[PDB]
RNA sequence: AGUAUGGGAGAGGAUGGUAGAAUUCCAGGUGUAGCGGUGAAAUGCGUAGAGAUCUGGAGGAAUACCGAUGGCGAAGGCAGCCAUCUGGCCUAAUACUGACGCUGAGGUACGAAAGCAUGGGGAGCAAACAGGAUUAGAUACCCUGGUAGUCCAUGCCGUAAACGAUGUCUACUAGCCGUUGGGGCCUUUGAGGCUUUAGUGGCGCAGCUAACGCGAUAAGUAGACCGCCUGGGGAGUACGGUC
């Protein structure tokens, strides 16, 4: 009701950046390999343990 | 789990009708593939939206 | 497919003893009941071949259980192979 | 002559370009305003800045058919989304709500080749 | 000789004579050795989305166990019969009995 | 090593049907000057009216979220939902056959993409090709279009950095921490803890290695059978032969 346009927009953005809406545009914008998909994947899962284990120990 | 169940499905479903990640639901696999199978057939006959 | 009750039935013809299940008989019969069964869905598929891969294990089985069947004895060989219809 | 009280105002954001249409409930336009427009023709289309001012000329032309709130609908990875409601709320306009409608495929086509650039 | 669950979603114009296309179905199945294990009726209710611009219908539900070529006569009257927008038909092992939810 | 009966997980394979998102096109309504693209441009496109938005229809291809150091397959590989046909694998104690095993020269089957032959289909992308740009030059990288092909049916071709750059099979040899499908045991108030089995990962003792490094999924300690190497280039080439 009174709530400011800034802070609607503001608000809009966090919801948007949530959603993760614009991240697969920015993916369809150009095709890629499976060969470039399997080592984007196994590296994301590579750092991703790396890090768990960092912080476990 | 089955697809009849919208109640509970929902729940595991987000808002924009995106399945929820099992990192974030703390399920078991089985559990999740059953899960996301009840969905689809659920979005099948209209119980759910496939999006929006 | 074969239901259990076929397979029930030629483990009874073929039984050499009571429960035998394990005979080379009883064994050779199945996989020739198996093998006759198949034939009829490799017609209405003849590009599956990733089943057709099983279909020639089943077949080297059986040549292999004949063969020392036939090392063991060579009258119940004949009278298997005669029974079966198999011409070696 | 026809005046609307409702409106909706897409905001169409490009890399290229950003462009806003402003119209009443159904879809039917009623003014619409460009980058280029309002000079700033060139690479810095893209600019919000350009966005900004074709929000204030749209809501210019808005004015006379007098609607005084308006959805939004925002379209498109640009700069300048926010500015051009930033714009809007300048203006005066009342926003009902804000959604974002850019589309998602379920992998359907086959996109362009990658650039070596 | 197997279980199936039926989900068919009918229009609601031609709602009005479901009961006698239900008990045509079943006279069908009953006609080969038949198995009508269950049989509900969810009610009208809303479409999430519009199919063929219907924006609600009446749904139904059966549980039967029935042949192959019943399955088949079935499958075949389903996309014939206009009434019948959108059907599914699912395989299930053992039978259930107990009355499902969302008849209530 | 194998068989029968009970249970389990799986994008394993073949055929048919069907759902939704998006793109391209076609047709109707609102309405006026740009749209598009790039490092900047320009080609291209727009007042026989575009772009934008809504509405309705046609068609092709591919399955977002789930999705994972996850799963299945001999390998190549396999992902929307439903039905039918169908191969393997894991799991418990009994019952049964009684060495029926391992390997394998020749031989044979399968085998990504591209390419070839007949018929069909053709939305998006795109070798060749046309044009616009940058450049001393542009024959290319960028941009505007675009054919074969990418798709379906029926055959052929037999090649990849077809890689773990590590042939198959069997037994033994400190430990610590994960994960997937099963079995068993103890707590309890229903979810936890322990052990075992078949897979899939991260550290690491001895041992091995020129070093890197491997380390119960060995590249350690031993056995069985097979394929392959003998300085670099000439050269996987010439002649002959098979397809």
Redesign the pocket.
């Given at each position: 009701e009174g709530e400011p346009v800034d802070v609607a927009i503001r608000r809009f953005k966090r919801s948007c950046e949530k959603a993760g809406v614009l991240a697969?545009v920015r993916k369809?914008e150009f095709?890629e390999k499976?060969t470039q998909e399997r080592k984007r994947?196994?590296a994301?899962?590579?750092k991703?343990?790396?890090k768990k284990?960092a912080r476990?120990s | 789990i089955d697809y009849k169940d919208i109640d509970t499905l929902k729940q595991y479903?987000?808002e924009?009708?995106?399945?929820?990640?099992?990192?974030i639901?703390g399920?078991?696999?089985?559990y999740?593939?059953?899960?996301?199978?009840a969905?689809?057939?659920a979005?099948?006959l209209s119980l759910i939206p496939?999006?929006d | 497919?074969?239901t259990?009750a076929d397979?029930?039935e030629i483990?009874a013809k073929f039984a050499?003893?009571?429960?035998?299940?394990?005979?080379?008989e009883?064994?050779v019969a199945?996989?020739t009941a198996?093998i006759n069964?198949?034939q009829?869905?490799f017609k209405?598929?003849?590009?599956?071949?990733?089943?057709?891969?099983?279909?020639?294990?089943?077949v080297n089985?059986r040549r292999?259980?004949l063969?020392?069947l036939n090392?063991?004895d060579h009258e119940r060989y004949t009278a298997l192979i005669g029974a079966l219809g198999l011409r070696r | 002559?026809?005046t609307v009280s409702e409106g909706?105002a897409?905001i169409?954001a490009?890399?290229?370009?950003t462009?806003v249409?402003i119209?009443?409930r159904?879809?039917?336009?009623?003014?619409?305003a460009?980058?280029?427009?309002?000079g700033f023709?060139?690479?810095?289309?893209?600019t919000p800045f350009a966005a900004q001012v074709a929000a204030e000329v749209a809501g210019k032309?808005a004015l006379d058919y007098g609607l005084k709130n308006l959805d939004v609908?925002v379209?498109?990875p640009g700069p300048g989304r926010e500015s051009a409601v930033r714009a809007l709320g300048a203006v005066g306009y009342k926003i009902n709500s804000i959604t974002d409608?850019t589309?998602?495929?379920?992998?359907?086509?086959?996109?362009?080749?990658?650039?070596?650039? | 000789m197997?279980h199936?669950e039926i989900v068919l979603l009918v229009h609601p114009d031609q709602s009005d004579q479901v009961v006698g296309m239900v008990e045509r179905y079943i006279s069908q199945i009953k006609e080969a050795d038949g198995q009508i294990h269950r049989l509900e009726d969810w009610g009208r209710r809303q479409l999430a989305?519009p199919?063929?611009?219907i924006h609600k219908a009446h749904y139904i539900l059966m549980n039967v166990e029935c042949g192959?070529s019943t399955?088949?006569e079935l499958?075949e009257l389903f996309?014939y019969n206009d009434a019948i927008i959108?059907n599914?038909?699912?395989?299930?092992?053992h039978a259930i009995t107990e009355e499902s939810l969302l008849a209530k």
């Open positions: 697969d369809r095709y499976p994947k196994k994301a899962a590579v991703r343990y790396q284990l476990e | 479903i987000t924009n009708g995106k399945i929820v990640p099992s990192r639901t399920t078991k696999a089985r999740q593939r059953q899960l996301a199978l969905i689809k057939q979005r099948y496939y999006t | 497919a074969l259990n397979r029930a483990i050499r003893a009571e429960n035998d299940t394990g005979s080379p009883v064994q199945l996989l198996q069964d198949l009829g869905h209405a598929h003849k590009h599956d071949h990733h089943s057709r891969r099983g279909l020639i294990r089943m089985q292999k259980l063969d020392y090392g063991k | 002559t026809r909706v897409h169409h490009s890399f290229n370009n462009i249409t119209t009443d159904q879809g039917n336009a009623l003014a619409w460009t980058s280029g427009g309002q023709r060139g690479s810095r289309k893209s032309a609908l379209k498109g409608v589309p998602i495929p379920h992998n359907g086509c086959r996109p362009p080749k990658k650039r070596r650039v | 197997r199936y989305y199919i063929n611009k192959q399955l088949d499958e996309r959108r599914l038909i699912i395989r299930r092992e």
